[PDB]
Structure formats: C-alpha cells, structure tokens
C-alpha cells in the first residue's frame, strides 16, 4: 500500500512538471487537497514516525529496548 | 457511501457523490426526512422523523 501511496503522487508530480505559476492544472492539485483537507491531514501526520528514538533513552529498561 | 452508512448505524462540507446515501433534514421543524412506515396502495408514505437514527432517514 505504501508502495502504491508513492506511485499515486508520482503521477501527480509528473502531472506538475509543466506548470506555470497559477496553472489550471496546478491549483486543482491544491483544490483537491482542501476538499480532502481533513483527509489528507491524516496521511501526513502518519509521518510523525528512529524519530521517536530519543524518548526510549529517557526511560530505557534493558538496552535491547523494552518500555 | 452506502456501506459507509452501514457502520455508524452499527455503532467538512464534503461534496455529494452520486450513489452515496444522504441524510435529509428539514429547514423548520428540523426533523430528518424519512420513509414513514405507513400507507395510503402498497408503498409507504414519506414523511419527517424526529431522529437521525434508523436507516429510513
């Protein structure tokens, strides 16, 4: 699914290669992201996730990991 | 979505899509519109209902 999550936005970035600044094909890319704003809000906050690694160090138990 | 419906019932100004189920609601009394289980000579009468709940709405 993540393999496909890439491919979907790839066609999109290949849909943006030819843009002017306020391109009709461009701001429609933004236009969907406001129509899906709450929806797109979720895909990207999924990328909160190493990253959190330092917090394990704050209360590490037994070096392998575990908390 | 029609089976998106079939989950919250077992529990953003999005654009209407064709083939979606939608919850109608009166401007005044603010009863939701529904298929009342009544007749006037087989098929049921339409009318408002007090609750958003329960399929017919």
């Amino acid at each position: 699914l993540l393999d496909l999550q890439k491919d979907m936005v790839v066609m999109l970035l290949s849909l943006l290669e030819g843009n002017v600044v306020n391109g009709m094909i461009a701001r429609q890319m933004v236009d969907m992201l406001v129509e899906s704003s709450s929806n797109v809000e979720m895909i990207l906050k999924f990328f909160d996730m190493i990253v959190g690694s330092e917090a394990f160090q704050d209360y590490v138990t037994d070096p392998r990991g575990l908390i | 979505s029609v089976r998106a419906l079939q989950e919250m019932l077992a529990n953003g100004h999005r654009t209407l899509l064709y083939g979606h189920a939608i919850l109608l609601r009166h401007a005044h009394s603010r009863m939701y519109l529904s298929c009342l289980t009544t007749s006037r000579k087989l098929a049921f009468d339409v009318g408002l209902q007090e609750d958003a709940t329960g399929e017919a709405c």
Side-chain angles (χ1 to χ4, degrees), chain A residues 1-49 51-56 60-63 65-67, chain B residues 1-40 42-57:
Chain A
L1 187 145
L2 293 177
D3 191 2
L4 191 142
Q5 176 69 57
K6 180 179 56 73
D7 287 348
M8 177 183 71
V9 293
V10 169
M11 79 162 287
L12 298 177
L13 289 174
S14 70
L15 182 144
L16 269 68
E17 90 288 12
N19 284 138
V20 182
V21 164
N22 280 275
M24 193 62 80
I25 187 169
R27 55 188 162 195
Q28 289 175 333
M29 184 61 68
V30 174
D31 177 66
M32 67 161 299
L33 295 177
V34 175
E35 180 185 330
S36 174
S37 62
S38 61
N39 186 342
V40 181
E41 176 170 9
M42 300 310 180
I43 55 166
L44 64 81
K45 66 184 301 186
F46 178 82
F47 292 101
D48 290 342
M49 293 186 292
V51 304
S53 174
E54 186 277 336
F56 291 91
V60 63
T61 271
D62 57 354
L66 280 62
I67 185 167
Chain B
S1 308
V2 297
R3 191 186 159 167
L5 176 56
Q6 290 176 335
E7 188 138 334
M8 66 161 276
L9 292 177
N11 191 343
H13 296 291
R14 69 174 70 185
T15 296
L16 299 178
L17 297 178
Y18 293 94
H20 287 171
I22 58 109
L23 175 68
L24 278 179
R25 182 183 183 166
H26 195 63
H28 175 60
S29 62
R30 300 179 80 240
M31 296 180 185
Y32 298 88
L33 181 63
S34 63
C35 183
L36 291 175
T37 298
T38 53
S39 179
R40 292 296 180 80
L42 153 65
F44 293 104
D45 288 345
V46 177
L48 299 171
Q49 181 174 354
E50 302 302 320
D51 289 336
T53 58
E55 289 188 323
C57 294

